[PDB]
Ligand binder design. Sequence first.
Ligand SMILES: [Cl-]
Ligand SMILES: [Cl-]
Ligand SMILES: [K+]
Length: 164
Amino acid sequence: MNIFEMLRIDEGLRLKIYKDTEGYYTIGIGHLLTKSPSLNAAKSELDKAIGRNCNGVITKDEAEKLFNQDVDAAVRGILRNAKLKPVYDSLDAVRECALINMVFQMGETGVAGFTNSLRMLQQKRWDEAAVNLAKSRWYNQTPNRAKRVITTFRTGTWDAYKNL
Ligand SMILES: [Cl-]
Ligand SMILES: [Cl-]
Ligand SMILES: [K+]
């Protein structure tokens, strides 16, 4: 298991524009197009991202390419973030994926708001961090995914993603 497989499981894959759990236009593997409620806006954003007239639909290759770029950006974002980098550096390779997962989902800013949780992870207080992470809108809005990620932080293993 690796970050790609992990995110592919949590985001799924759709080749046509769809609305994500918050109602935002998305495509591919969780690639957010826009927060605007205009399908047209979303359609423009798509073409611009892909570089051709897609008319709302893309290929699997295209989805995967968007996917590589998005993981890359999440990582680069974590590294450029003064609150995130220290944490990520302190973490083992499995747990780092859990952090990348959150940033992919919520963005650099959102995660950086989990201040108390971030400190607990840095101190390696796994159970305490897991409880803290659960006291969030994120857990309440997407509990199954949040469970998987928190379990990953808690255990250092891929158990939560095995048998999926
Ligand atoms: Cl893009
Ligand atoms: Cl969920
Ligand atoms: K590390």
